[PDB]
Subunit: 262 residues, 4 copies
Amino acid sequence: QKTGILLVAFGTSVEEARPALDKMGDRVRAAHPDIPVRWAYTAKMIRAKLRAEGIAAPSPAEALAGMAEEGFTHVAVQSLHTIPGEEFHGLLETAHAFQGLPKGLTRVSVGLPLIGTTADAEAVAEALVASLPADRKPGEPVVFMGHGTPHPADICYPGLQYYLWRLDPDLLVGTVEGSPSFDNVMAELDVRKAKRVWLMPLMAVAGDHARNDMAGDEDDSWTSQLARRGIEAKPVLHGTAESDAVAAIWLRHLDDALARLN
Amino acid sequence: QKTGILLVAFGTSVEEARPALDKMGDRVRAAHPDIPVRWAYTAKMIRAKLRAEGIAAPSPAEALAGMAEEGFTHVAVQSLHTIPGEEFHGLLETAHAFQGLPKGLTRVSVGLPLIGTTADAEAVAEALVASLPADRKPGEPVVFMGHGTPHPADICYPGLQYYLWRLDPDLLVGTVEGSPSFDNVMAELDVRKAKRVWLMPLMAVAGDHARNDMAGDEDDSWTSQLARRGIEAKPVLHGTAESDAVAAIWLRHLDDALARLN
Amino acid sequence: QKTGILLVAFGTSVEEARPALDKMGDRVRAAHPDIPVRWAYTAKMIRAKLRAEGIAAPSPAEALAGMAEEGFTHVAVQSLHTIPGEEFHGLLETAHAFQGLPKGLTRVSVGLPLIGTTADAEAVAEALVASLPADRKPGEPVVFMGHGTPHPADICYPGLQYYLWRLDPDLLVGTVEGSPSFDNVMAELDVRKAKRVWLMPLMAVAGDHARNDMAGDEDDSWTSQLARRGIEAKPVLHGTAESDAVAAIWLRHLDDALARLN
Amino acid sequence: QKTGILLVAFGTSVEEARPALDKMGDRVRAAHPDIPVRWAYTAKMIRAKLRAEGIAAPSPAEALAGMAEEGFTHVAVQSLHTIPGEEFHGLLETAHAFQGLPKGLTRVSVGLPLIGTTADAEAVAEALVASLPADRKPGEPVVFMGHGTPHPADICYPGLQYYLWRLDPDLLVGTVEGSPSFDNVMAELDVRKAKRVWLMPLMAVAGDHARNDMAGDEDDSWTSQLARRGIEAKPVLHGTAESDAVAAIWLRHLDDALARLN
Ligand code: HEM
Ligand code: HEM
Ligand SMILES: [Cl-]
Ligand SMILES: [Cl-]
Ligand SMILES: [Cl-]
Ligand SMILES: [Cl-]
Ligand code: NA
Ligand code: NA
Ligand code: NA
Ligand code: NA
C-alpha cells in the first residue's frame, strides 16, 4: 500500500510564469510531508514545448503509467484548473481509466478544480478580493481574465461574476474565448465611466493568455483596447496560484481527494 | 438498424402536473414523426409512486434494457432536466453503460439538459422572459424557483441569474436546496421594496416543489414568507415545459443528440 | 444492503426440457435459503419464444435493471453455461456494466461456467462418468454432445476430452458447431468398431440440439448417421443439470461468486 | 491518422534468449514495412531486471501512453503470449482502457495469443511438429513445456495435447504450474518405456523456465528427474518464436488485429 499525489496543471513553458507552480508544489509538500508528489500537464502543446527545452513533461497518462510502475497503489490527482471544463473532464476520464487495471493502481481519486461547488465559487470570490493589489483604490474596476471554453462549464464564469458582485459591484469577469466576452466587459466599464482599470488573470499561472491576450503590445490585447478608449489599464501578471487565499481552495480539494482514497 | 428516442424527465406523480410531459411528447413526435419515442424517469421515489398507481414508470436502465430487447440499435436519450447535475450525470453514465453491450444497443447518445452551454443559458433567459404571464407589469419582480443541488452544476443558477439581469434587473433566481437561497432572494426583494412579486418554477414540470415549497399554505412556503413581509405573491403553477420558447431548447438538444448517432 | 442471486441459463422453450432448470432453482434455494433468487436467459431467440407463450423471460440486462429497482445492492450472477464462451463473456460484460451505476447495484459478481479451471474440467469429467446410465456396459462408447463455438473457449471441448480419456478411453466429446466435430467422433468410433454407442448432452438442458441434432428422426441427426453405419445408438435426453454430481460444480462456482461480493 | 503496432511479449532478461524477440521484430517489419513497431513487456519482474541493466522496458500502459504522445491514433497490440490467460486478459483490459481517451488513441485492437481458436490450436500442433529437431527419431517422445496457470485458459494445454496426439501419439504437453503436470508427463513416459525424450519450450522465448525448470543442473529440473529414471533427456533451448511455422500464427493474428482498426 503506497499513496501518492499527482498535481496536474494546464502547464506553462514561460520561465517567468513557472515558479508559481513550484510554489504550489511547496504548499502541497508542507501540507502532506510524508506523501510523494509527482507532476503532469494537460496541454499537449505545452508538453511539446517543455520537451523541446529538454524538460520532462509527462501527460496525465504517462505520469500515472510511471507511478503504477513505481508501485503506487492509491493516487490523489489534483487538478490546478479553474473550472470543471474539457481539460478537467479529460483528466477525470484518464484517471479513472487507470484505476483497477490488472497489477496497476488500486484507486485513483481526482480533486475538484478551483470553481467546484457554489460554496467554492463564493470562497473563490472572497479569495480574489483578498488577493487584489494594495494600490487598487475603492471604485477602480478589476477585470478577472478567464480562458473561457465552449464546454458547458463555461457557465462557471458568469456564476463567479454573480458572487463577485455580491462583494463589490466594480469587480468584473471576462474571458478570451467564452462568456462574458471582452466586449461585454467594455460595455460594463463604459457604464461605470471608469478611468483606471486593473486586469488580473483568473488562471493558476500567468501564461501566454495573461501576457499576450491581456497585456500584450499588440492592438488586440485587452490593455491596448483599453488605452484606445482613454482608460489607464493596470495589468497584474501573476496567476491565482500565487495567492495564499486562492491556493487554500485547491489544497482543501486535495484533502478531499486524499480522503476519498480510503 | 433501428433508431429510437428515450425522453427522460425527473418525473411527477401529480396529475395536474403530468399533462405538461405529454405536451413534450407531442412536440417530439411532431418534430420526428418516424422515430419511436419511449419514456423513463430519474427519480426513484416518483417511479415508486407511479407504480403504486398502476402506471408503468421505467428507470433509464429498465427502459434501455427493454429497448435493446425490441431490437433498437441507436438511441438518443434526451434529458428534460434543467442543469447537468447529479441526475443528469447519472443518466449519462447509465446511457453509456448500455452502449456497445454484446447483442444490445450499438450507440446511445445523450441530449444536454436545458442550461447546457453559456449560449443555452442566454437562450433560456430569453425564453423565460417570453414565457412571463401577460399580467406581470414592468418593474414587478419575478423569482424563478430552481431545485438547487450540492453538485458542482448548482453554479448554473447564479450563471443564469447573470443572463437574466442582462435582460431585466428585476428577474431573480432562487433555489430550494442550493444557491442563490430564498433568503438571498428576499434580500434582493427588500432592496427593491417590491410590493407584488411573481413566482415561476424553473423546472420542466410544476411538481411538489412548485406546489408546496413555492406556493403551499404552510408557513415555510415562499408565498407564505412573502405574505408575512407584506408582499402580494403571485405564484404561477406551470413548469417551463409548457412554454414553446423554453421547449425549443430541449428540442434543439435532441436534434444534436440524434445527429451524434451517425 | 441486500444480496440477491441471478441464475442465467442459455434457456429452453421446450416444456419437457424446462423442469431441469426448476431443479437447479430448488438446489440453489436449498443451499442459500435466505437469499432471493431471480432468473434470466442469454439466448435472444429463446426469450422471444417464451414471451410468445405468455411467460416472462428477462435478458440479463432486464433482470439486473429490475433487481436494482427492487433495492438489491449485491448480486451474484451464476452462469449455467458449459464453457466461458461468447455467451458467458457477454454476460460478464453486462453484469459489470451494472455495477457501480449511480443509485443502482453496488457489486455484481459472476460465477464461472461449468468448465472453469483445469481443476473444474477434471471434476466435470468425474461427474459425467458418475452420471452415465446404469445400463451402459463397460467398453460401450459414450459421446458427449457440446454446442461448440467459433469463440476461443471452444478449446474447452478438446481439453475435456483429455480429462475424460484419463478415466475411460471410450468416452468421447463431439460438438455440433466446433471441434471435435461429429465426423471426428465417427472416426473415433470406427477405430473402436463399436456396435452400441450412448449419446448424452453436455449442456445444462436437453433443448433443440439434444432433441434434433443429436437424436432427431431426420437423416442428419447423430442417431440417424450412426444407424446408417450399423451402430445401435442410445440417446439419453437429459441435460447435465439433472445430475447431482455435475450440478455441484455450478453450486461451488455460485458459492465462490457470493464470497466475491464481500 | 497514424497507425502503429505494439508487440508485447512476456519478456526475458537473459541475453541468450532475447535475440529470438528481435527475430520476431524483423518478421513484423518485413510484413508491414510502412507501419512503426514499438515493444512492451508484461512481466513486472522482467521490466525491473531490464531497467536495472540500463535498458528501456515499458509496460503496456507506459508504451501506449508514449505512443499517444507521439500522435498515433490507431494501434494494433499483438500478444506474443501462448494462451489467453491472466497476462493476455490484463493486456486486453489495459489496451481497451486507452482507447477513446480524450485527445489520445482512437482505436486500440489486440491480436490473439498463439492458441486462440481450436483452428489455431490445430495449426500450432502442426507447426510444433514442423519445428522438431531433425535428430529426433520416430517414436522418441517430445515433451512441450508450457508455463501453466491457475487462470481458466490453462485448459489450452490439455486442448493442445488433444491436437498433438492426432498427429503423433508420442508428443506430450506438460506445464510447470498447471495441468498436465510434470508428474502426469512422467506417467505418460513410463507407459511408453521411452529411453530418449526431447524437451522443447512451448513459450515464445526460452527464458528462466526453459533454462532452469526444464533443463537446469538442479535435482528438481525436468532433465535431472528424467536422468534419475534412466532416460536420456535431450533439451532444446530455443523458444517457439524461433520457428517460422509457429511465428506465422502470431503474424496472422496481427494481420487480423490490423484489419480490426478499420
Ligand atoms: C459545472 C460543472 C459541470 C458541468 C457543467 C458538467 C457537464 C458535463 C458534460 C457536458 C459532460 C459530457 C462529457 C463532456 O462533454 O465533457 C459531463 C460528463 C461527465 N462528468 Fe461532468 N460536469 C460538471 C462537473 C463535474 C464534476 C466536478 C465531476 C467529477 C465528479 C463530473 C463527472 C463527470 C463524469 C464522470 C462524466 C462522464 C459521463 C459518462 O459516463 O459518459 N462532472 N459533465
Ligand atoms: C478458456 C477460458 C477463456 C478464454 C479462452 C478467454 C478468451 C477471451 C477472449 C478471446 C476475449 C476477447 C473478447 C471475446 O472475444 O470474448 C476475452 C475477453 C475477456 N475475458 Fe476472457 N477468456 C476465458 C475465460 C475468462 C473468464 C473465466 C473470465 C472471468 C474472469 C474472463 C474475463 C474476461 C474479460 C473481463 C474480458 C474483456 C476484455 C476487455 O477488457 O476488453 N475470461 N477473453
Ligand atoms: Cl500588493
Ligand atoms: Cl399569460
Ligand atoms: Cl440410470
Ligand atoms: Cl534441427
Ligand atoms: Na480560467
Ligand atoms: Na431546476
Ligand atoms: Na455445451
Ligand atoms: Na506457455
